């Protein structure tokens, strides 16, 4: 076991090295900042066309159209300002767990419990919407998808691996393999140069797309982590776990920075998102409601209680004008 | 106001009525989840009926449309996707009755049954559990006793009471005997009258659901 102890020595060395740089305790640096106050938001729209519990959603960069998927076998594209249904796509396998919406707006993607990522062409001739590609090769179940270009997409699967594809060829360009449990979430950096993932190891890793190597590993949670999201600067991210706790990590200091927990919240977090300035942090819970946190002070600043079942998805527009939340309730609201 | 937005509203209404029709059409089917241990009887039950990630099967019997989902080809954390099947009409659990000797296997089947019966999502759904391979059990019961798997069995080594003992051991594993029912059937590889048993169990489930909806329950 001479080679099974050098790992322990290196772990101790890493712990000491990143404990030698901890001298500030962020909550002790933001002591003089003034609190945000009380954040009070009202629902502006209710979007009701689904006949089952919706599992994912995504905003368009237009900041007006969004897509949502449910176990009813449909994903349908909405117009937020008027609540008009622009499209309604019948999809082949009813067990879908994720959605994505291309930055250009020409395509959408879907996937789920059938091990396949499907890509649909929205802006086609001849009228209707068609299936462009159908990417196979995972062995688990699609957990998340994110478009890079019109011809590139990173996927996360419950077979412990992530992958990078090119859509016209249909083959995996690169595979990232360092986790030991299922991979449940994914987040692209603002410049799409490197991303971060969260698995059922209670650990998160930082990959770079151009070389397929893990750069850093972040630990500190106590259970499965279900959500992940970058800070708008691209130099930190937040996580959400079954631990009933979120927490903020730092890519340059290489360690935890703060934790967001309450003594009377004993339930897991399903989703996580930030604000346009990155000052307050949203988080969806299984308590049928989602909390708003003050990211620089850890205090609670509000509550969004308008659903009658678990909130399973949550997103904020690119212009920071509204937030949308879906739930197993089968509705999704827009809060401004 | 609403210059050519009226065409958009009309399109929304048309696709909305199409969604309503599709939902109504899909709300009159019974969905069945097919569980079981590793290669117990799950393959032959699909042939008893008319017939990557999961495999769906369709069939009809007396003006009723069925749907079996087999999720045995997906090895991963089961607690991360088992809540998708909440609301399934019933569960079909296949147990190999002749695997009380090989390895232990019956104890694994018992552990799986106990884990699935007392789950946080399936606290209400009923179970239709088959005991496959009773002819091999006929053959093997005389050669070797049933005390190999149950050390506390006190009875003759004949099929007629060993089968009842095994059935009772499976029956008495559920902690809610006033809320969920368990239907047992000693099936085999021939005389395909199993779909009638499934039909009767599903009809009882449907009657109970209707009673709950009407407010009488």
């Amino acid at each position, epitope marked *: 076991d001479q080679l099974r102890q050098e790992a322990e020595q290196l772990k101790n060395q890493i712990r000491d090295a990143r404990k030698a740089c901890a001298d500030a305790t962020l909550s002790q640096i933001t002591n003089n900042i003034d609190p945000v106050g009380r954040i009070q938001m009202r629902t502006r729209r209710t979007l009701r066309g689904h006949l089952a519990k919706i599992y994912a959603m995504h905003w368009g960069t237009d900041s*007006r*159209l969004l897509v949502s998927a449910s176990q009813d076998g449909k994903l349908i594209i909405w*117009d937020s300002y*008027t609540t*008009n249904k*622009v*499209h309604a796509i019948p999809l082949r396998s009813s067990w879908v767990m994720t959605c994505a919406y291309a930055p250009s707006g020409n395509y959408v993607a879907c996937g789920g419990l059938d091990n396949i990522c499907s890509i649909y062409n929205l802006k086609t*001739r*001849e*009228g*209707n919407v068609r299936v462009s590609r159908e990417l196979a090769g995972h062995t688990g179940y699609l957990s998340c998808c994110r478009f890079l270009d019109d011809n590139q997409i990173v996927t996360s699967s419950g077979d412990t691996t992530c992958a990078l594809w090119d859509i016209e060829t249909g083959q995996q360009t690169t595979t990232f393999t360092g986790h030991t449990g299922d991979v449940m979430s994914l987040s692209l950096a603002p410049d799409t140069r490197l991303f971060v993932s969260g698995a059922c190891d209670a650990s998160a890793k930082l990959w770079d797309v151009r070389e397929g190597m893990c750069r850093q590993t972040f630990t500190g949670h106590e259970s499965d982590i279900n959500a992940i999201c970058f800070f708008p600067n691209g130099n930190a991210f937040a996580t959400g776990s079954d631990d009933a706790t979120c927490r903020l990590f730092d890519l340059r200091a290489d360690q935890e920075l703060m934790t967001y927990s309450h003594d009377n919240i004993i339930c897991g977090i399903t989703s996580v998102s930030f604000s346009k300035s990155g000052r307050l942090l949203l988080a969806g819970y299984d308590d049928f409601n989602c909390n708003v946190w003050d990211a620089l002070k850890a205090d609670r600043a509000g509550v969004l209680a308008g659903h009658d079942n678990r909130v399973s998805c949550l997103g904020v527009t690119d212009d920071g004008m509204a937030v949308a939340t879906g739930s197993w309730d089968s509705f999704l609201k827009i809060w401004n | *106001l609403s*210059a*050519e*937005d009226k*065409a*958009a509203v*009309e*399109r929304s209404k*048309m696709i909305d009525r199409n969604l309503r029709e599709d939902g109504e059409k899909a709300a009159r089917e019974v969905k069945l989840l097919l569980l079981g241990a590793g290669e117990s009887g799950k393959s032959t039950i699909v042939k008893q009926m008319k017939i990557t990630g999961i495999v769906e099967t369709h069939f009809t019997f007396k003006d009723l449309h069925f749907k079996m989902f087999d999720v045995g080809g997906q090895r991963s954390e089961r607690k991360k996707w088992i809540h998708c099947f909440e609301g399934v009409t019933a569960i079909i659990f296949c147990v190999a009755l002749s695997d009380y000797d090989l390895v232990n296997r019956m104890h694994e089947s018992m552990k799986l049954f106990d884990s699935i019966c007392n789950n946080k999502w399936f606290t209400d759904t009923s179970i239709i559990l088959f005991l496959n391979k009773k002819d091999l059990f006929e053959e093997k019961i005389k050669k070797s006793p049933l005390t190999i798997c149950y050390p506390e069995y006190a009875g003759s080594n004949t099929y007629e009471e060993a089968a009842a003992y095994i059935q009772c051991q499976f029956e008495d594993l559920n902690k809610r005997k006033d809320t969920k029912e368990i239907y047992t059937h000693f099936t085999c590889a021939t005389d395909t009258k199993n779909v009638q048993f499934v039909f009767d169990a599903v009809t009882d489930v449907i009657i109970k659901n209707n009673l709950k909806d009407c407010g009488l329950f």
Partner: single-chain antibody
Framework: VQLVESGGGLVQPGGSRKLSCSAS????????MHWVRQAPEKGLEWVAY????????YYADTVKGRFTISRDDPKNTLFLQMTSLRSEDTAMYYC??????????????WGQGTTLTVSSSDIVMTQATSSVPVTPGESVSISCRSS???????????LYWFLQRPGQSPQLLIY???NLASGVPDRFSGSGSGTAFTLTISRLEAEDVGVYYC?????????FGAGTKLEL
């Protein structure tokens, strides 16, 4: 994508006729369809409109009562029943494909035309010029003008530009005054405030010679312009 019309020919005044438009190559039941006609040596003029699902129909005031529009979705055909044909109905009839949702481009594909011969508060769109001589490589501008502000309270101005080359059917260029239809080279551009619009062609070669029309989609009936012709 194809639209083919049939049912023309010489008719006597007071008679009746029926035209057909057989569509093949696109999802027919998702598109609303129009009938547009053009006199022997004159501009275009709208006739009738049948929505998707047949839930809405409109007619021009000069044909209301005598004409009837209907569609048969399973057969992929569009009909127009004409009765009491007077001598003013001599024209060529086009079949036009149009779909409306958020961000679509209606009026994009036109049929090919069938010629019919009969024996012997509206918004006014003004296209003052009627001909301009041009040279290849230069830049040309074309101006339209409306009697009412085409800007709506939701920020959309509803102005459309078409092109009809010699011997062919017209073709969409710009929709809602600034958007380029797919397949149109980026030489063309559109601009202008409410009640005054302009089309700009930069570095124009051959195959840009024809008549340019200007249409409003703010409210029915839809009205066209007189047309500006570019000669060589």
């Amino acid at each position: 994508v194809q639209l083919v019309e049939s049912g023309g020919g010489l008719v006597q005044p007071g008679g009746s006729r029926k035209l057909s438009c057989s569509a093949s190559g696109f999802a027919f039941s998702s598109f609303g369809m129009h009938w547009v006609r053009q006199a022997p040596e004159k501009g275009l003029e709208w006739v009738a409109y049948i929505s998707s699902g047949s839930g809405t129909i409109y007619y021009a005031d000069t044909v209301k009562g005598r004409f009837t529009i209907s569609r048969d979705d399973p057969k992929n055909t569009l009909f127009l029943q004409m009765t009491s044909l007077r001598s003013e109905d001599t024209a060529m009839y086009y079949c036009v494909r149009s779909i409306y949702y958020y961000g679509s481009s209606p009026f994009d594909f036109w049929g090919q035309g069938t010629t019919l011969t009969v024996s012997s508060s509206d918004i006014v769109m003004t296209q003052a010029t009627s001909s301009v001589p041009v040279t290849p490589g230069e830049s040309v501008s074309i101006s339209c003008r409306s009697s009412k502000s085409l800007l709506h309270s939701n920020g959309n101005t509803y102005l459309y530009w078409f092109l009809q080359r010699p011997g062919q059917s017209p073709q969409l260029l710009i929709y809602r005054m600034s958007n380029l239809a797919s397949g149109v080279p980026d030489r063309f551009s559109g601009s202008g405030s409410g009640t005054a619009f302009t089309l700009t062609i930069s570095r124009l070669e051959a195959e840009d010679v024809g008549v340019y029309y200007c249409m409003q989609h703010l409210e029915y009936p839809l009205t066209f312009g007189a047309g500006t012709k570019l000669e060589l």
